Design a protein around this ligand. Sequence first.
Ligand SMILES: [Zn+2]
Ligand SMILES: [Zn+2]
Ligand SMILES: [Zn+2]
Length: 178
Amino acid sequence: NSNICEVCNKWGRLFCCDTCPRSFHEHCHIPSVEANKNPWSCIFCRIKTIQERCPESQSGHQESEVLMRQMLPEEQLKCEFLLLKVYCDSKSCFFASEPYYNREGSQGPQKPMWLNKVKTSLNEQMYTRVEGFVQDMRLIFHNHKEFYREDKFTRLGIQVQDIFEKNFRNIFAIQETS
Ligand SMILES: [Zn+2]
Ligand SMILES: [Zn+2]
Ligand SMILES: [Zn+2]
């Protein structure tokens, strides 16, 4: 197994996957690494199993249909993985914790949002459809763009949103377009 966390690329107290070489800190994995279970399979393995059990699940889908899906176990998992994929980028540090807004010439957003809040909301099963999760994720980046205006710092929102969106298309097998 790897000697660094797959998500944050640091060493420390790591839990190893039994079915692939990845390793995780406890609260870097999503959901948090489970107490018992031997063997244990990580989220990457669990997602691969879904695909292998239903190869047709990788045929293209319309985003509008994906968003209206109910958060049953498999969609719950897919959202957990998509969230994990954003945490895997180091630039997620800017969006992880609760932000605050005091900048000359800007007003803070009406509905602040951050990745740890989405993490908790998933953990507490507060989303009933994929749409709920996706709207909150997109809101993180949209609030950032709007607040930072012409500051070049706005680019961090663009960058991390692109990671999100690419992984969304991959995980939920959105029909490729030009
Ligand atoms: Zn980690
Ligand atoms: Zn694994
Ligand atoms: Zn089948």
